[PDB]
Amino acid sequence: KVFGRCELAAAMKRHGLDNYRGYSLGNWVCAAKFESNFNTQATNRNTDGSTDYGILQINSRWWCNDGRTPGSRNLCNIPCSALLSSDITASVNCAKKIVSDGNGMNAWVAWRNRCKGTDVQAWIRGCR
Numbered sequence: 001k002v003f004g005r006c007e008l009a010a011a012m013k014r015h016g017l018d019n020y021r022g023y024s025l026g027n028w029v030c031a032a033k034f035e036s037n038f039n040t041q042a043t044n045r046n047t048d049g050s051t052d053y054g055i056l057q058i059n060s061r062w063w064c065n066d067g068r069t070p071g072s073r074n075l076c077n078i079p080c081s082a083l084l085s086s087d088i089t090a091s092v093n094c095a096k097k098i099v100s101d102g103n104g105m106n107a108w109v110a111w112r113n114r115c116k117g118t119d120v121q122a123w124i125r126g127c128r
């Protein structure tokens with residue numbers, strides 16, 4: 001599924017991301033936009049043997065188990081394929097774990113580069 005901006009904002013708000021650990025909702029919309037272009041099926045296979053999966057491009061070395069990645073810790077306790085669903089719940093739940101395990105949103109390259117220091121509220125402005 002390729003979400004619209006306001007659609008995805010509403011789904012993320014229903015799953016409690018607004019002000020999660022002090023990150024406003026527009027941060028999370030912005031991260032997904034520059035990670036995956038709001039595409040739930042996005043994958044990126046890296047040269048190091050890990051793969052990034054889904055709308056927040058969660059990586060298989062630390063967070064999910066794909067059976068193909070050396071070193072994997074599976075800290076979100078999920079198969080990586082569960083992050084390729086049209087339903088964002090698994091991605092959201094895992095992201096919450098990523099930010100809590102002492103990581104900020106700096107964990108996401110795209111957030112650090114394309115969202116940090118910008119007006120992220122633009123990404124939800126005009127939505128209901």
Ligand SMILES: [Pt+2]
Nearest residue numbers: 011014088089
């Ligand atoms: Pt939902």
Ligand SMILES: [Pt+2]
Nearest residue numbers: 011014015089
């Ligand atoms: Pt829901």
Ligand SMILES: [Pt+2]
Nearest residue numbers: 015016089092
């Ligand atoms: Pt949820």
